[PDB]
């Protein structure tokens, strides 16, 4: 249980360190690009858009770590648990047990 917790914790911060990584790459992006819409003359309400669009792709890259995040908590908590007479639907959960 040792070592195998041991990968899942390394593992699980893994896939932790990618979302913060990814996450800070996208919000210089936006800063880079709402750089350059204030450098030429823009509409506010354009500037907005672009911060609402912007905000909205780091939402998405944040989710798609959170399920990551969770199917391997799922993971784990399913195997430690794990007892004869237990049933497992998912399929893809089970072939990764």
């Known amino acids: 249980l040792s070592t195998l917790e041991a990968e899942m914790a390394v593992e699980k911060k893994a896939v932790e360190d990618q979302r913060d990584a990814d996450l800070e790459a996208r919000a210089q992006k936006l800063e880079a690009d709402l750089a350059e819409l204030e450098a030429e003359g823009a509409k506010s309400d354009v500037r907005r ?17 959170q399920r990551e995040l969770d199917r391997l908590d799922e993971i784990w908590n399913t195997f430690t648990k794990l007892a004869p007479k237990q049933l497992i639907v998912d399929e893809v959960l089970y072939r990764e047990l």
């Open 49 to 65: 858009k672009v911060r609402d669009s912007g905000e909205r792709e780091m939402r998405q890259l944040r989710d798609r770590a």
